[PDB]
Amino acid sequence: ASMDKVFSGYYARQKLLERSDNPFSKGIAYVEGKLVLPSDARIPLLDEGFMHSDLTYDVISVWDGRFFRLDDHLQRILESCDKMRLKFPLALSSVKNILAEMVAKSGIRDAFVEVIVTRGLTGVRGSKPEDLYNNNIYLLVLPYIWVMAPENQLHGGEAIITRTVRRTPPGAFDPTIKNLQWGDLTKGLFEAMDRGATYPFLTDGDTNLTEGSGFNIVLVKNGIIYTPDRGVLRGITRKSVIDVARANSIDIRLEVVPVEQAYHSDEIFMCTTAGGIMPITLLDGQPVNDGQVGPITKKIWDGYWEMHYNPAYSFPVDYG
Amino acid sequence: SMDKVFSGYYARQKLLERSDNPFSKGIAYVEGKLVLPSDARIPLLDEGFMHSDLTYDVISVWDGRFFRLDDHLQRILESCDKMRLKFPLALSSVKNILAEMVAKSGIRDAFVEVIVTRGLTGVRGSKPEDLYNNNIYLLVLPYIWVMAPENQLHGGEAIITRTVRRTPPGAFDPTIKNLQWGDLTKGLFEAMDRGATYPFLTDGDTNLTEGSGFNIVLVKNGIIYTPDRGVLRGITRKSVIDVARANSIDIRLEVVPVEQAYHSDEIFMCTTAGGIMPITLLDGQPVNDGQVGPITKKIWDGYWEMHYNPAYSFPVDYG
Ligand SMILES: *Cc1c(COP(=O)(O)O)cnc(C)c1O
Ligand SMILES: [Cl-]
Ligand SMILES: [Cl-]
Ligand SMILES: [Cl-]
Ligand SMILES: [K+]
Ligand SMILES: [K+]
Ligand SMILES: [K+]
Ligand SMILES: [K+]
């Protein structure tokens, strides 16, 4: 649907949420079998998710009371756990039920839902593999988080190609495993600050684009969509962009994307669960094309938000 | 001598193991309170967890003496500056608290960890001025060994990793000591899979870097070699350089090709959590004659001697 329809609905739902006297309207967490306010939630100091960031995670959205692509996200964090040699510690059916219960209890209709699986209390260094499967899980539901605020999506945002940092390469850490080892991405955020921009686009140092601080990067040139095929998370928002492109008969190329190409793009946008489809209209301080949000970006934008109401991709939470 | 130094540790350990003090198992300092490390808790929303947005350092106490504490605290300050963190206590205060914790525990041989995190406000969408309410956690445990003492007589088994390479400096500055161990942890598993213990990571560009919590040192034709870049500037490594200089042994901090590991006369690792740790098997083959070598032994001896030298150590008052 259109930006104005999507956002006006969000604003109405928010304003209602903000008037709520339910303390869980600010979020809810599940830690050691108990529901607690996120500010009160605590984890063991000795959890290896803290002591060596030895964890994977995933993030799902709820929009207008509808979970979006929950099955796809759960499959992804099962794959991440397998790649990490972590045993996912709950039945999938159990996690699905608990997450829906959390969202319902909060009353939050537009939510950010985070699932974290850590190595647990026994570190890898000095352990037998069979002693490394008592793994911990933490669940968190918050009001929907925007990597680009609604008001900013109308006009687009300001990016830089980073020059003080490059993406951690796959031979150091497999970027298809969604992880919280953000040392490169965090530095990119600071570089953007220092350079008067907001969004860092990290290279691989070998002249190609990868991803940013919590989003994939998409270029549009001569009617074709391009996005990096390696060095990045296989985003489910990106997956959804591919679906919308198919529905619209727009060619999309998953391939190596040289940095040079960003400087001649007709359109650029970022994509992620925490915000959706986020246009970029300034790059390294200069306009991207004419400086306007472009027509293919808008088609993708509208189709992406329509998927949030499509029963093939979403289901409603029962708030009771 | 591996006899004198270890035998003392074993006696001190045996005494500690019979202690009735609850803190003989360790002690932590969290939000101004002393608690057992198993009971210690951190906020879920701390960015040290939520984005591993932190630095840390580790200091030892050996035989009741802090080793090179001031060097470690200087390093932590440098790591905080590089990370844009504001170290949240006076150095005098942290020194006093750490000594108080060690004394309260009764532990004579200790692993002491200091962690500084970004705190509760994440970097994205934040003004820099709002990112300086940074958190600190302190932890004292019984001394941890990356190579157990009895194993140091024999040496350990290393591999040059082939499924992982070290995070490059352009992705994260390895001179900032950090807990983003994704490469190092995978190296530990690779070593497991290959029937070894210690992973030596490359840079992918044919040179050695460091391993999973230690620096790498080669010895060839009487000269010591260790990587200059891509690694933490270890304080154990610093101490190796001091001992080499005291013994008139040539030590070169330079790029060290992987190839050279396959021809070394001796190899050892170095770290606070274990000291000087010989490697006598590499990729399943003996290093030289498969014996702990003479230069390694001289470095080991000198390293432990420094723990009693007032220039490098001071005694904790256990009251
Ligand atoms: C989560 C994330 C993305 C986007 O993933 P989605 O599956 O679209 O939410 C992109 N890059 C990085 C580094 C991420 O952590
Ligand atoms: Cl998930
Ligand atoms: Cl620190
Ligand atoms: Cl320190
Ligand atoms: K997982
Ligand atoms: K698994
Ligand atoms: K620090
Ligand atoms: K600082």
Ligand code: NA
């Ligand atoms: Na991520």
Ligand code: NA
């Ligand atoms: Na480290």
